[PDB]
Structures are given as structure tokens and as C-alpha cells.
């Protein structure tokens, strides 16, 4: 049994590590903290990969996920001391999780779309953020489904006065394309995406190619050039226009492309190939034998663009959008991308589910209330498990008050008392010493599907850990 | 949790290290580096540009005090000292049970109080004519006469205020001067209307990428080989001469009769210049750099009006000035951005401490205490100065503060040079409003980040 | 704070070493004497008595628990196990950040709530005519006999005409060797110590007894005194002097009647012979308690000098006859059994019975045990806790949980699933409105503790909850243990 | 200077151990007795009485505190807490370069400011009629009897004649067993010590008491000699000799008409036999104290010589009674002329809480007789005094300025500690309470460390006796001054 308590102490150590980074006064962004911190325990490795890739790619609030999981396990230990089997604790945790998720529907205030309604909600995820809200709303709406379904994913990425921030109709990419004397504007680009090397086909037998004179040296250069010309014709045989290429060719070879009118980009990175292959839909060609008119990107416009000193190229009309934040100072960016990411994510969740619950611990407290209600009407030991789930739900408001210098148990208990007395499920922690506790008066929303993903994912992690023993590491 | 007092102890150790080098009576520091010479000097700008990094917070003290202040002001030592004082008081606040967030917020509010109070203390300096010069005498007046014009040549003087870091070191040159002669003197010693071709590429024949082992037999093929690579070199000369070409600046060299190959082709060049010289010329003449192996175009060439060799070589009619033979140019630039000044010697810190104290006396939430702490933190600048001049620190500082309240003179402050009547006004100890604002705001950013 | 958590750990260990011996299926625990015998027995009173302690907190617990509850009767184990539960909950409250003083205050609140609720659970028992015993067979084959012996012994030895108190001059003498049920109630006192010199008559009518604590020594002098015998005539004069003063002692005793004369110290084998030639018969080597029992039972005197003996102070006993003392001015119970362990166990159960009777005389209200009263008090405490704002709230709820350790322990001691049985009995108690519903740790089929008759005395349970709350309050308020 | 900062660390250690035991919610401190019982109680006087006396600075604080405050008042904890606060504040002034003498002089200045401000804060209380009793309940659930017992104890042994100062003539005897309500008021004296014999009359009425300090011993020569008895007849003659002189001393006592005779020192096993058969009730082996109580209570003079007394120097206790308490027994003197309080409670340690609590009540009443002015506690007087000290501090030039401000802050340790001892946020609660004192102009507003009701200390009736607080701040300033002026601690 002790292995379970060891796991509980490990995951509890992770959650306690990430408690102080919860809330606006955190000490952060738990997504980056988990994405960077290295973990020794396998249970700590399992705290990540479940909180990171499952929640950062759907919603946000990863810190709340790991903290809630740590509280759940910490209560589950005290439940283990009474002799309750871990399967019972996990089942009760699942039942209480159902209760809370259902209570989210009862707390939820619904917001509409298509006329503001989301942009003002985006002003909360941060003048400095009105134009960014506009760019996020129009960005998601540009690549949104909206033919009911209400599911559209991140085909949108951001590149590094902020009033000059643009929405790029297609895809922006670095790398001026090989030799400036090439046509700076390719119209209807039949892109050839190649991840293959540019070397003559070397025979696979004993070489020792003893070139004895300068004449045979120049002839060797002429052969090495001839094979490359053959490659140019092998590419232009199925749609020229452009040729995205990882690997380079250097000065002598570049000309041959220019002379043969085949615009091309030199040794792009890992991305910018996947980026352009997704934008233009053209399949990548990795081999020097497997390219045709079927594996070609279908760009409508490709052009090189300068900014005084450096220059990058854009490709628009592609078969699906990017955000270009030009603002200078370069200390602002990578942080405008965080609030803008929260914008795009909150918008995506609002398209998926247009219901919001009010944060600051309010929804946590009222969910703990509902779970406690469904616990007081139950026999079997799962009763204690449900009450423990409520107590674990009440760690988010406690953690907020803690990180804001307030007395956690006192302020949390008083706020819960106000939630029961005033029938207001939006009363929570102040966190900023800013007026009242009414979160709707403070504009703190958290998108029902996001909170539901928090509770559900934390429950999944906790149940998985509540099983697991023996860890057979070599 | 305990890591806060530890990090505060480390950054405070960095501050106490540089406490003795503050003021005109500051102590020098040996500071040798890797198996080389020794550079004895005070002025914490170069001290923090060196100083091995012990803690991660110890490095965090640099580049915030260094890159944020040296590029706007110069008072880096005051920045790190003030930061160490703010953290040292922040520890005492952490003893009372204050949360660090409230300490940082109170430090921000008090910083607003002081920065705004500087506007009230500020004296105005006039521009557009001669007598910005004598002010510079505070930071053989010729240097001043050189500095002012040196900025004014590359300054806007209208409302955009950008002239940053384009000047370097008894006369002023309207362009840029660089070393490294013309490489083979038979070249034109005065290139006129120079379409400078700045290439940072190697000069080698394009070797193939397959198995070689060139087995040249009998001197015949040896001479044929030398003639071959010289032929390709001539092809390169025609690659540059195809685009303006008037002059060619190269990071790599040739180092034989290849110079003649240029001379016979009439393409003057310069051999083996460094990076922080190629960039200097490239921005000076506005000529894009060519990195790839002689894949250039006519737009990536400099357009310098005149470049000539002198008994080194000079580049004029460029764009963008150099002084032919900083402590003044920074003050001048700050005066152009904002012509308001405050009086140093710790006076501005004492009056700002008074303003923060007053604005803290009527205050609710615990940030009150923090603000009070901030005031005391500022008063470390006078005391330290007194300490560096052998005077009783708290005695002298208390007297100067009491006089600043009694006489309503926000310029009374430490006369560490033991010269005169404690006034700083008729002592000409000036500190340029933007500089002091940058000090307070920067130290506040460091402290609030460590918290 | 860490020192307080260590104190909670030591106290919790003391409780864990005790909860296994709670209830009728309680385990035994050897507890060897000081390089001597053993005493295999549950009943946490003797356990805490014979237990030596290491930690000062444990020492404090062992002193405070026996300081009151054992002087009341049963429940000495419930004090330490309930204290351990309260401290174990108080730890989980400390981890939340609640100050210890708030936990203690909430524990006092819940203590008053539960103690007030016991008055509502309470029933009533009558004390004037018999059939108190049905409440006594619960305290302990021959339960009716022992119950009648205890009730008669207490009702004989009691004020009861107001004052409502009982002073235990009841002596329980257990003689190994008998037939399990030959236990008799003797209107008088019985002690061992045979008559000195066998030829003294084993029967004294109208025995006027002289109780002495003086040594049978020649009248010694004071000051320095060095005695030098210079001739055989002075040696014989010494022996004759001591015989003279001795017979002076005997005649001095017989001047006041003195049919018998118990003495605490011994004789000389020459002494008891001179006592045989006179009609004095005496007993020797009795002992302090055994001469106090005779002192108040016979209307004695206990004089430490023979020469100051007067007839007015003699203790009258109608018949002195081990040796029995009947007809005097005081009752004793003579337990008889078989294989060395019939008694001592009969002594223990009889002690429990006498305690129950005395407490019933003090307060004739009872609550039904088996953990039922603890569950009902827990329901009341949590109910009042839901109607409380400040942090004390939590503490009160914790107190409730702490109470529910008494069922869980009992269940645990009878092989049942503690959580499941305690929860089932708590739900059955909520729905049936039956506060006399508890753990059936004897496997009798029923759960109603009114049936099966499990009694616990109101003031006994009150003393349990109050004393345990006091101990937990002290342990929670202690730090900086000096140890000079 | 390093020695001085070491002294500050030791003193502030003594303070840090005791600020947790400040207020009604103070922690208990186990402190066992060397190899015996324990004494678990929150009380600065007792905690400093035990107190691991290690550092000479700590022993110095323990010396001064009990040397004055506990001998005149009671507030022994706030002296050491405030002293530790003042030294901890003085450390940062030492680091600023301020000389210790300037610091101590500043603490004296601000201490005078606060002591003078207490007079402004002071309120009043009446005497002789029922007004003192209720404000004894605050010296703490049946404490209504505590007030009555203490007030009747001070007013029975009345000063009444003015000049207004009086203590000793009150003993508190505690016998374990019972409940707190069993505490009864006062008639005369109650001491331990059974008589001297079982058959001694347990009730000696109209007892003319003989108070002796002599031994009941036939006087020895004292010259180094050896008593050699050569025959049994001379042995008997010795017994008759010393019995004879014993009886001479007995009849020497009862010739003055002594119905009772206390002895204290010498009393053999033959002596009480000869005193019983002579019908002279007597008690032996009584301490030095509990005899002058008999001398003043029964108006008798202490007879020194081996029975050279007259009826002029005898007692006159109306009824002497021996009382049993289960197994032990005490001796009480009623109808005398000096009183004593008999306390019951049981549970081995309740009769200690209630004992020193009653002591605190008696001290409060005595201080009210001295000066019937009080300030309202709960840290209110400390906060108001801190406000005054800061007011005078901002209007001061030389470095004493800083010291004065320090003193202010030091005072505010008393509220914070209280807040800390009640689970509240100390800095926030103290700050808010002080701001409320400024706005509402209510100097009787301090930490509600009992969590019951409002904030103003006029309700809850928390009084402090002006003389007590004045002597508190004065004594703490004495400690801090002495420690500041100390270095070099030699200690051979
Ligand atoms: N303005 C606000 N006021 C109160 N609580 C907030 C506010 N903004 C965010 N929070 C709370 O902070 C919690 C965690 O967010 P944060 O600490 O920023 O990182 P993450 O979103 O990764 O958890 C959320 O549960 C939310 O309730
Ligand atoms: N002549 C002077 N009289 C008084 N103070 C001076 C004088 N010159 C410089 N100072 C003070 O010295 C401080 C620090 O300057 P210094 O130690 O030379 O390097 P840095 O400017 O990098 O801190 C300034 O804040 C200024 O107030
Ligand atoms: N026959 C019984 N049926 C159910 N419970 C019982 C029975 N006898 C005793 N108990 C329970 O056992 C508990 C402990 O009693 P015991 O261990 O004998 O001594 P103590 O009362 O000192 O703990 C009591 O609280 C009582 O409720
Ligand atoms: N009922 C109360 N309410 C508020 N404060 C109190 C109360 N009783 C005592 N105090 C405070 O406790 C402080 C210290 O008293 P205490 O802890 O009993 O030890 P001492 O009397 O030795 O100082 C006093 O300054 C007083 O202000």
C-alpha cells in the first residue's frame, strides 16, 4: 500500500511547487513551468503529459489542474488512513466530478456571438488589448467552422507601435528565396516541397576517384553541374513556379536555378516545411525520385517583403491564417503572444460552448457546495470521497487568497457563507484588492468547457494515480 | 519560500560590493581577467561588464543595471546600490509578515511618487545654441565644444529624439574613420564616389562535393592549377565589377599576387577587417552585407561619397560621425530628449524620500510601510557618499535632510569633495531628469522582479 | 509548530497502544512488574497505572487520565483514545493553517454541545429499593449473586438520606480456594493474620479491642546514654527489668478490660508467651490499612502508646473469630473461587459494579453505550457546527469525527469493518431516531443498546468527554518543553 | 560591539520564547521540575522563575523583572516582550552607526513621552462600594466569585487608613479535590500540619495559643562528655530525670493558661505522649512562615526561650479545628484577633490556575487602592502611546529621532503578538486598529484577541491600572538601557 502514498507524496510535491504560481499574483504560466521543469519520479512525469498536452491544447488553467489534483490526492491519503480501498476513493471522486460538472451548467451565464459579445470577453484575458482582441476574434472567425459543429482548431500561429499588428491572410515565413535577382513575385505557385539532399547520385562501390589533372577537375565540376541541371528539369517537369527546399546549394548552383527560372527557398528549418505543407496542402517529397504534380503545394501568391533591413516572404491565397505583431521594443512580444494565445483559446472554447462560469474561485466554491449536497444524501463510503472532493475543490480559492496575502481559510469560509446566503454563484476571491467579490462585476469569466476540462482532467489523473503500483522501472 | 531571503542576500552582496565605488571619492577595483593584463578603475559600468557571476540573481543584477542604464544614462552604481537597499529593507518587511507582492506594489507606487517629484524639483536647461557647452564642463573645454556639435550633427533637434549610439572615438569627422590600409599601395589612395561592396564571404575556388584526391603529376599541372584558381578569382572580380564596384571591403583576404589581380582589374579593396568594423562601415555607408559566396546584387553596396587613405583611412559623405583625437554625449542626448535637470549629491534622493514619506503618511493598506521603506532606501545614496568621503553618514545625511525641509531647498546634498557650501546648485552637480527617473524606475524594476 | 506536532505524535502513540483493549473483546497486554510478577489484564486504568512513560506529553496524559476518571470508575480508556482521536483530527486542522487556540476553543464548544445532548439521550434509574442490579449485571454465571452483593454492600455503606455520597470502606478480600459462588457478604470486616501463639482461643465474646502501634520494647531513655553492665547480677537485673516493664504493659492493657488487643508490630516469642499466661489474646503484624479498617469498623482508637490507653477508646466488636470481625459499629465482601484467576477477575467486575452503583447514587441518569451515545453526540455536534460561522466550525466537525472513533475502535476489536459498521449504525441512528443504537461487539444479533442492556452512566460519559477535552486542550496549548 | 549584538540575540531569544505566551490565548510552557512534578501554566512570573538560566543577559532580565514588577504589579511578560522588541529595533540603529548611548537616551525620552501620555489615556474607578468587583472579572466560567473573594480579601485586611499601600497578611491554601465552586471565603488562618497525636482534641475552643521557637528537649551540658550508666537502677533514674524535666516544661507552659501550644522546632515522640497525658494540645514542625501568621492573627508574641512565657504573650483564637481532606489533614484557626483564602478545584492542576489568577486579582485591587486610575488594555494603550511617541519623534532633530520612532514600533509589538496569539493576521489587524484609533479618536480600541464582540476596550472591561503600565514601560526601558550599556561580560 505504501507505494500509493509515495506516489501521492510525489504528485503532492509537484502541486505544492506550482501552488504559488496560481492566480494573477502568481510567482509564471504553469504551462511553461511544466513544459520546462524536469521531473524525477514517474508519477511526476505522469502529472505532466496529462496536464500539459491534454489541457494546453484544449483550454488553459493548467496550474489549476495540477493544484486541484494535488489537493485531491492529499485528501485521498487521509481517506486511505481510514482503510478505504483506493478503488472506492477513485469511484467517489468520479461521482463527485460528475456532480460538479453538472453544477457548472447551472452556474453558467450564456454569451452570444457574431456582434462583439466575444471581443469584450477577450478584453478580460490580459490601451493595450483592444486591437489584440479584434485581431483574435477576426482571426478565429476567419478559420472558424460555424456550420454548426462548433469545432475548429489551431490552424493559426503568431510571429514576433503595437497598432501595426496585422492579420496575414495566408502564411508568413522568413528566408528571402535564393538570389535576389529571382522574380520577387510568384503568381499561382505550384510549390515543390522537398526535404531531400542535392547531391549527384554517388555509386555504391569502391571509389578512389583519382583526378590526375586540372582538366579532369573542370570536367568533374561540369558533371556535378550537369546532374543538378537534370534535377532542375526533374522538378520543373511537374510544375515549376517555386521549390521550397531543406538543404542548400551555394553560389554556383543558385545561378542554375536563376538561369532556369525556378524560384526556390534555401534550407528552411523543421517547421516552415510543415507550415507551408499544411497551408498549401502540398505533400512533402523526401526522396529524389518521388515528386509529381500531385505532391505540389497550391499557393496563389508568393512574394518577398522587406522592412528596411531584413526581409521575409509571405504566401497568401492558399488552397489558414497567421498573426504578425510588429511593435518594436521586442521586450513586449512573447508576452503579447501569451495574452493573445489566451484570447484565441477562450474564443475557440466559446465557439465550442458559448457558456461561461465566473472564476476567482467562485465556481470552485459553488461546485464544492453542490458536491457536498450530493454527499449528504448518500450512504456507502463514497460519501467521504465526495466530501473530500469538495474540500479539494476549495483549494483554488484558498490558494488565491494565499497568493494575495489574505487569510485562506477565513476569507474562503466567509466567501462560501456569502455564496449560500446571497444565492450568488459568482462570489469569489478578490486577488487584486479591487472593490467587490462579485466576479461578474469584475469581469472574470472562464468558459464552462474550460472549467469542466479542469475538473474532469484532474479527476482522470487522480484516479489513474490511485490505481498504479509496483512501478517496474529497469 | 526561504529562497527569497537567500536571493536578497546575494543581490544585496552584489550591491555592498559596489557600495565603495560610489561618488567622486569612490575606490578603484583591480579586476584582472583571464591570463592577461589588469584594468584598475571605479565606475560600476565596467565593473558589472566584468565580475564573474556567482548566483543567477547575481547575473540578473547585471544586464538590468547594465544594458538598461548604460544605453540611456550612466549611473549604474547608484542603480545597484539603490536596489540592494530596497531589497535589504524588503527583508525587514518580510519579517513583519508582509507578502512580497504588496512590497513590490508599494515600491512601484513610491517609485511613481519619486519620479513625479523629480518634475517638481526639475530645473530647465536651454538648447539650440552655444551654452549647452559649459554644463558639459561638469561631466580644456574643447571636448565639450566637440561633444555638443558631434551630437547636433547627427541629431534631429525636433520632436522625434533619436540619435542613439552612432558616435564613437581634437577634431570631429563628419563620417567614420577606420584602420587597415588600402592593401597594395598602387591602388587609388583616394576612392571618390565609392560604391562600396561589403563582402564577408571567402575567396576560394568552388570545390566540388565528391571524392577527389587531386593527383597532379609533373609541375605542368601545378602551374595549370595556379592559373586555374587565378582564373576563377578573375571571375569573382568580374562578379564585383558587374555591380558598381568602386570599392570592395572584405572580411577575408588574399595575401599574394591576387592583390595585383585586383589592381590590374582596377578593383581596390581592403583585407581582413573585423566584424565590429564591417558593421560600422556597413551602417556608415548604408551598404548591405554580402554573406553568401559572391551572390550579390547592385542594391547591397555602400554609397559613400569619399574614402581615402591618410598618413588608416577615412570615410566621409556617409549618412554617422566620429571624434578624432561618451561621459558628455549621454548627458547631451538626455538633455535633447528632456531638457530638465535635477541636482545630484544625493539631494534628489533626499527630497524624493521626503515626498514618498509624505505620500505614505496618509495611506491605508500595508503598502504604507513599503513606501516608507522605499524612502529609507533612497537615503542610502547620501549616506554611502558620506561613507566614501570619511564623514559620519547618518549625521551628515540627517543634517542635510533637516536643512532641505527647513530651507525648502531640494538641492542641498553631500559635498563629498569637501568643497564649499553644500548647495549643488553653485557646485554644478547636475544629473538630468531622465537619468534620475531611469535610476529609480530601473532599480524598482529589478527589485520588483526579484520579489 | 513542529514541537506541537511531535507532542501530538507521542500522545497518538499512547492512544494507539490503548484502542486495542477497548470493549469486551479488549486485548490483554502483559506489563511486567519491577523485576517481579505479571498482570495480564485489559481495563485501561490498571494499564495506565502500571505503564511507565518516556515522553513528557505521554506522562502528562497518563497522570491526567487517571487523575479523575479512574477515581470515578470506568471509561479510563475512552479518555485516552478519544484524546488521541481529537489530537489526530487537530493535526489535520493544523495543516490547514488554523491556529491551535481556535481548535481548542471549537473543541470546548463541541464538548459543551455533546455534554448537553447526553442529558437528552439520558434515561433514569431508581435508588431506594432493589433491582438496581439489572444495571449491575451489565457492569460485570452468577451475575445475580455478585450484583446483589454489590448493591447490598453499597446501600449499607452510604448516606443516601441526602448528601448522596458513598465512602468506600467496603473491603474486598479474595481467598483463592472455593467453589466460584461461595462469595459472601459479611456484615463486618475480615483480615488475615492468625492469632499470635496458637493456643489462644479462636473465639472472643464482647471483644473490647485495644488497637496499638507501639513497639513491644523496653522503655528506652533519651539523651545520649551508654549502658555498661558490670556484673552478672546487673545482667539478671536487666532481664528482670524488661520482664517487669513488660508485665506492667500487659496489666496496663487489662486494666481497661481488653478482651483482645490488636497490635501493628511484632512480639519476641517471649512476649506472646507472657501474653498467653494472661487472658489478653493479641494479633500481630497487621498493617496500617488493616488497622484503619478495624479502627473505624470497631469504633477503635489506634494509640501509639500503651500507657496512655484508656477504656473509653476501646473498639467494641461483638464477636471476633483468616479471622472474622462481626457485630460491631462497615461491611466487607469475601470472594471465593477456584483456579487462582476466578478471583481478581471477580474482584475487577465487582469493582466495576460498585463504581456503577456509586455513580448512580450521585446522578441516576444513564446513556446507552456500545458507541451509540458517541454517534448521537457526534450528530448533535455536527448539527450545531453547521450553524456556526468562524473557523471553530471546522474544529467542531472534527470533534464529531473524533467521537466516532469509539464505534470504529469497538468494531475493530470485534473483527468488523470499522468504517462500514460505524456508517451503517450512524445512518440507522439518523433514520430510526434511535440514539441507543450502537456496535454489537458481542455478536448478539441486535444493535439496539437499550435491548441487550449496555449502560454507561451519564456523569461517567460527561467526565469522559470533559476530561478528554481538557487533555487535548492542554496538549494543544503546550510548547517549549524545558527539561532542566 | 559584537558582544552587545550577542546580548541582543540572547535577550530577544528570551522575548521570542515568551511572546507566544502573551494574552489570554497564551501558550503554556511545560517546564518540568528537576526530578519531580510539572507546572504547566502561562505566566511570565513563573516562566521566568524556572527559565533555563544560561546567558548572563537572560539571567539579568529575569533578575530585574521579578525584582520589581512581580513584587509590585503582575505584568511580567510584556516587560520582556517589549524589551526584546526594543533591543531588536536597537540592532538596526547600531548598524546605522548610532552610538548605543544615543539609542538608550532616545528610548528614555520616548519612554517618558509614553508614560506622560498614559495619564491622558487614564480612566477612573471608585472604591468601597461594589464598583471594584465587576472589573475584577477581567483579571481572568464562575469567575463572579473570584472578584468577590479577592475584593473581600483586600478589604478585610484593609488599608482603610490612608497613604494607600498594603499587601501581605493574605495566604492562599489549596487542597486538591472537588470543583472550583467549592472555593470559600475567609474567616482566619488555615495552615497544614496536623496536631501531634491522634487522640489530641480535634477542636480546641477558646485556645490561648503558646507560640514557641524552642525545642522540647532536656538541655544537654554541651561540654564534650560521655554518659556511662553502670547499673539498671541508674538507667531508671535517667528515665525519671528526663521525664521529670519534660513535665517541668509542660507545667511551665500550662501555668500561664495555654490551651494550645505551637512548637515549630523540637518535639520528640516522648514529648507528645507527656503532653497528651498532661492535656496540652500542641502542634509541631511548622515552618518559619505560618508562625508570624499565628503571631499576628492570634495577637500572640513569639516566645523564644525553652518555656519562659507569660499569659501576656499568648494567642486567643476562638476555635482551633483540625480538618481531614480524605487522607491528609490541615489545621484552621477561626475567630481570631489577618485572613487566608481556601481554594478547591481538583484535577491536580486547576488549583494553580485559579491560585495565581486570584493573586492577579489581589494585585489589581492593591494597585487600585494605590492609584484608582486604569488604562484600557488589549494593546490599545500601546498603540496610542506609539502614536504619541511618533508624534514627538517627527518633531525632533538629532539621531534620537530615529530611536524615538524605534520605540514607537517597539510598543506595537504588544498588539501584534496578541493578534498572532489569536490566529489573526498581526500586521493587518494592528494597522487597521491603529487607523481606527486615529479616525474615531478612541484610545480604548485594541486587539479583540477573545473573538467575542466589538473592538473598543471599554466594553469587555479590560483595565490595566495606570501605575502598572507606567512601571511596565519604565522597567522595560531600564532593561534595554542596561543591556545597551553593557559589553565585555567577564564572568570568572
Ligand atoms: N482577475 C482575476 N481575479 C481573480 N482570479 C483570477 C483573475 N484572473 C485569473 N484568476 C484565477 O487564476 C487561476 C489560475 O490562473 P493563472 O494562475 O494565471 O495560470 P493558469 O491559468 O495556468 O492556472 C484561475 O483559476 C483563475 O480563477
Ligand atoms: N562633484 C560631485 N559632488 C557630489 N556628488 C557627486 C559629484 N559627482 C558625482 N557625484 C555623485 O556620485 C554618484 C555616482 O557617480 P559615480 O560613482 O561616479 O558613477 P555612476 O554615475 O556610474 O554611479 C552620483 O549619484 C552623483 O550624485
Ligand atoms: N456488552 C457490551 N456491548 C457493547 N459495548 C460494550 C459492552 N461492554 C462494554 N462496551 C463498550 O466498551 C467501551 C469501553 O469499555 P472498557 O474497555 O471495558 O473500559 P473503558 O470504559 O475504561 O474503556 C465502552 O464505551 C462501552 O460502550
Ligand atoms: N480579555 C482581554 N482582552 C484583550 N487583551 C487582554 C485581555 N486580557 C489580557 N489582555 C492582554 O494581555 C497582555 C499580557 O497579559 P498576560 O498575558 O496575562 O501576562 P502579564 O499579565 O504577565 O502581562 C496585557 O497587556 C493585556 O493587554
Residue numbers in the entry:
A (entry chain C): 31 to 57, 72 to 170, 180 to 213, 218 to 376, 382 to 536
B (entry chain D): 31 to 169, 182 to 211, 222 to 363, 369 to 376, 382 to 387, 403 to 528
C (entry chain B): 31 to 170, 180 to 360, 369 to 376, 382 to 536
D (entry chain A): 31 to 170, 180 to 376, 382 to 536
What are the paper's exact sentences on this?
The CCT5 homo-oligomeric complex has the two back-to-back rings of eight subunits similar to the full human TRiC complex. Moreover, the human CCT5 homo-oligomeric complex is able to hydrolyze ATP and refold misfolded protein substrates.
In this paper, we describe the crystal structure of the human CCT5 subunit. The human CCT5 and CCT5-H147R subunits were solved at 3.5 Å and 3.6 Å resolution, respectively. The CCT5 equatorial domain is formed of the N-terminal (residues 1–154) and the C-terminal (residues 418–541) regions. This domain contains two nucleotide-binding loops that interact with phosphate groups and the adenine ring of ADP. Loop-B - 103GDGTTG108 - contains the classical P-loop motif, where threonine residues coordinate the β-phosphate group of ADP. In CCT5, helix-10 consists of the residues 309EANHLLLQ316 and the proximal loop of the residues 234FSHPQMPK241. We have solved the CCT5 homo-oligomeric complex in the closed conformation, which shows intra-ring contacts between the equatorial, intermediate and apical domains. In the homo-octameric CCT5 ring, the stem loop β-strands, β1 and β2, interact with the C-terminal β-strand, β13, of an adjacent subunit. The sensor loop (also called stem-loop), 41 is located between β1 and β2 in CCT5 and it is composed of residues 63DKDGD67, where the DXXGD motif is observed for all 8 human CCT subunits. Analyzing the CCT5 sequence and the ring arrangement, the rls loop corresponds to residues 343PRFSELT349 and indeed makes contact with the substrate-binding interface from the adjacent subunit.
